[PDB]
Design a binder for this molecule. Sequence first.
Ligand SMILES: CC(C)CN(C[C@@H](O)[C@H](Cc1ccccc1)NC(=O)O[C@H]1CCOC1)S(=O)(=O)c1ccc(N)cc1
Lengths: 99, 99
Amino acid sequence: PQITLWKRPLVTIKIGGQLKEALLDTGADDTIIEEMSLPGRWKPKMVGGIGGFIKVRQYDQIIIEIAGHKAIGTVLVGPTPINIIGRNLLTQIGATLNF
Amino acid sequence: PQITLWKRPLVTIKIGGQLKEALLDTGADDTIIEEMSLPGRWKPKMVGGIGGFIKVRQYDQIIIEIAGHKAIGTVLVGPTPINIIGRNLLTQIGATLNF
Ligand SMILES: CC(C)CN(C[C@@H](O)[C@H](Cc1ccccc1)NC(=O)O[C@H]1CCOC1)S(=O)(=O)c1ccc(N)cc1
């Protein structure tokens, strides 16, 4: 699709067999989702945003369905105001910005 | 142009007669620029994201040239770690997210 930006670019994602809403965020380097249980071991990671840094849990090789497109990669879990799909996954689905 | 997301989508902008580098951010509702002097009255506002909230000054009807494209709208000025071009101005230049 071609998504205009008059409204927040929200899509449905499927992760852990659950359906969730997420923001397509070109300004986020990584993908961060709200607290949920994911499989595997995690590593610590410091993530910087508008108000400073936070501590999140990094899970690798996670299967995630983004607006019907399947992707497999790194997902961070932590206290985010909204589920964000960052560049790491946007590239996997071949998303670009055009103007 | 067609911007791939392997790297951060930075562009050159012109605001208040100064040249700055900024992030084309679909996850940002509004544009936020690092501390600078702008003409006009302004209203204080609080903006939040990852890491909490920052206090900014809201300037209205500011003209900004985004990669050679002139646009007009609200600009928030404050202690942001990076200059962000949000949806309020991306729409004006006809930017879309495609996949
Ligand atoms: C958190 C989302 C919902 C909103 N933010 C936009 C996001 O694109 C934000 C942009 C940014 C990049 C680098 C440093 C600081 C900020 N990236 C972000 O947090 O990157 C983290 C998450 C994964 O990788 C690192 S915002 O900055 O809080 C914001 C809020 C309101 C306005 N009007 C403008 C901006």
